[PDB]
């Protein structure tokens, strides 16, 4: 529709930058892999891999999403 349009080339023209800018601290974080090493969210009981720990993916997961959700 139209009216989708409108938002759409508002929110993608506008919003970028905007989206960027919040996230850009966040790069340096991903990037480094000192302290987030390696780890699986997955909470998936037919692909849930026994060698990692349903309880430590649930709890990693959240945990890195609140930030998100703060942000």
């Known amino acids: 529709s139209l009216a989708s ?4 080339f508002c929110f993608k023209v506008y919003g970028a930058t905007y989206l960027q800018k919040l996230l850009d601290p966040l790069l340096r974080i991903v990037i480094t892999s000192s302290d987030w090493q390696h780890v ?11 060698s990692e720990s349903l309880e430590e ?3 990693n997961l959240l945990q890195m999403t609140e930030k998100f959700f703060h942000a």
């Open 40 to 50: 699986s969210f997955e909470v998936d009981p037919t692909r849930l891999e026994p």
């Open 5 to 8: 349009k409108i938002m759409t």
């Open 57 to 59: 993916n649930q709890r």
